[PDB]
Amino acid sequence: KAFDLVVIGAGSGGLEAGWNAATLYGKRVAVVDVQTSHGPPFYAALGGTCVNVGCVPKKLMVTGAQYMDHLRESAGFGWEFDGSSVKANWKKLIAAKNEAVLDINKSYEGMFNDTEGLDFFLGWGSLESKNVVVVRETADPKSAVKERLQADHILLATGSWPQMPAIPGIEHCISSNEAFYLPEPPRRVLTVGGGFISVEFAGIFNAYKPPGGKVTLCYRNNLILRGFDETIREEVTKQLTANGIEIMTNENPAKVSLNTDGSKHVTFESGKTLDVDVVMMAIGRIPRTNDLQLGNVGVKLTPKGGVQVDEFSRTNVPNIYAIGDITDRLMLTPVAINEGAALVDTVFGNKPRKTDHTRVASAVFSIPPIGTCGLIEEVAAKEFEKVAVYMSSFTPLMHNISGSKYKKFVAKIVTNHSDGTVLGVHLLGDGAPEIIQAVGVCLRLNAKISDFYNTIGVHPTSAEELCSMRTPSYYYVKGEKMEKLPD
């Protein structure tokens, strides 16, 4: 079996590369993955982490969680019903999520069956030589060989995996993988970590918890969501707290033990203790390099765990490439897709293309959600002499009527004040993920603040706030925050 391209990992980046190479350039492509559908024992499968245990199921479950707010908020608009009859059925949510993910799994299987020159191989891929991918029954190099795929080009696209801390009792904890299949919703749950996964699941568990429940989120440092706009970091903290979620900053689990009833007794480094039914570790994700036998061929890793690549996704070994989370840069599905498409254009279409990793728009599906693109102000302050910050914060009108007055919308714009170029936009509130997409197009066009405030607004929307800010709220000159420019 001799192929133009062998892809290890049928995920976001791998599938884009395979589909493009086969359909746009008529190449013979083989793609390897460990399962054809979502779930245990391997969780990720055909379609990748995003489809199976990532963006897709997460979005469906956050959507379900939002109905706790919708039901309560409907009363302010005249909707009446027996509030004591409201119950949330977790099994129905999981079952419905499983059907939707499975429909995607089945669709991708049909893609392979019907696309000439695009073949799927079930098993574990690893590097035997520079031009041979071996597929084995299990991740263990001692397992039986299923196929040896001769490859002119090899693409490593195995994604990432939850990082689990080595504390006593870690075996009593779960990761996001298992959270997607919990048989019942935890009455008490501890989500460990300050990143988007911990925050998003905290909102899910908070909505579906049985009566007398409580969600606690802990984070080793002082403020959650490191890397996001600081104003938004503080606001989501308040709006999470306002919805019943306890946030434990400057705390970190030291050990976990079992109570007689099966619940978990958590002890933190500070000495505090907490009894919960589930402990979900979401402290990070690390590149999935352990099963590929990279040493057989000499593929180098970076000082971090990621496969080292240049801007064209080339490793140090000729004709072996790597994209997506395994490179440990921006762990986002659309980035992996773009890298895979650019790689195929470069290798097979003599159209050199490289992914732009700046000005990438992204979102956090907390409740309310975050939408962001570009630099935060403290980063821009170290790269530009004069930086201006335009800021607007307000409780939308519907939320004064709804009774959720804590739901303040935040809109921030960071600019290079020398010429007004927009460096970053940061949004908190309903619709922020949908708003920020086209803002990404604006930033690619090097839009200036005047391009925004001279655009006529759409009324009434939250987005029009971005076109209503023409005077900076404060500045950073040579890195120093100040309300007004010197002179």
Ligand X SMILES: FC(F)(F)CNCC#Cc1nc(-c2ccc3c(ccn3CCC3CCNCC3)c2)sc1C1(N2CCCC2)CCCCC1
Alpha-carbon span 9 to 124, nearest angstrom: 9
C-alpha span between 213 and 244 (Å, rounded) = 10
Only segment of 73-81, 159-167, 169-177, 479-487 that touches a copy of itself (CB under 8 A): 73-81
- How far from 202 is each of 27, 225, 370, 459, 460, CA to CA, in Å? 45, 13, 15, 33, 31
Q: Which residue is nearest to ligand X (CB)?
A: 110
Which one of residues 35, 126, 158, 333 is an interface residue with a copy of itself (CB under 8 A)?
333
Q: Per-residue contact track with ligand X, 360 to 399, x per CB under 6 A? A: -------------------------------------x--
Would you say 190 and 281 are in contact if contact means Cβ atoms under 8 Å apart?
no
396 sits near ligand FAD (criterion: CB under 6 A): no
Collapse the DSSP code of 446 into the 3-class scheme (helix H, G, I; strand E, B; otherwise coil) and give the result: coil
Using CB under 8 A as the binding rule, whether residue 60 contacts a copy of itself is answered as: yes
How far apart (Å, rounded) are the C-alpha atoms in residues 160 and 170? 19
Distance, C-alpha 83 to centroid of its chain? 34
Which segment (78-86, 152-160, 162-170, 291-299) binds a copy of itself by CB under 8 A?
A: 78-86
Q: How far is the CB of 252 from ligand X (least distance, A)?
A: 35
Residue among 16 and 345 whose Cβ is closer to ligand X = 16
Q: Give one DSSP letter per residue of 374-418, joined into a string.
A: E--HHHHHHH-SEEEEEEEEE--HHHHHHT-TT--EEEEEEEETT
Residue 67 interacts with which of a copy of itself, ligand FAD, ligand X, none, CB < 5 to 8 Å by class = a copy of itself
Q: Is 459 a catalytic residue?
A: yes
Nearer to ligand FAD, 180 or 390 (CB): 180
Total of residues contacting ligand FAD (CB under 6 A): 37
Minimal distance, residue 435 CB to ligand X, in Å: 17
Residue type, 468: S
Sequence-separated (6 or more) residues with CB below 8 Å from residue 224: 194, 195, 198, 199, 217, 233, 236, 237, 247, 249
With CB under 8 A as the contact rule, the residue among 23, 379, 431, 473 that binds a copy of itself is: 431
From the list 32-40, 376-384, 434-442, 479-487, the region that binds ligand FAD by CB under 6 A is 32-40
Question: Could you tell which of a copy of itself, ligand FAD, ligand X, none binds residue 81, using a CB distance below 5 to 8 A set by kind?
Answer: a copy of itself
- By DSSP bridging, strand 188-192 and strand 278-281 are parallel
Nearest in space to 364 (alpha carbons), one of 117, 32, 62, 92: 62
Q: How far is the CB of 49 from ligand FAD (least distance, A)?
A: 3
Residue 382 CB neighbours (<10 A):
11
Q: Which residues are annotated as part of the binding site?
A: 12-13, 33, 45, 49-50, 58-59, 112, 115, 118-119, 125, 158-160, 193-200, 219-221, 226, 284, 325, 331, 333, 363, 459
Annotated catalytic residues are: 459
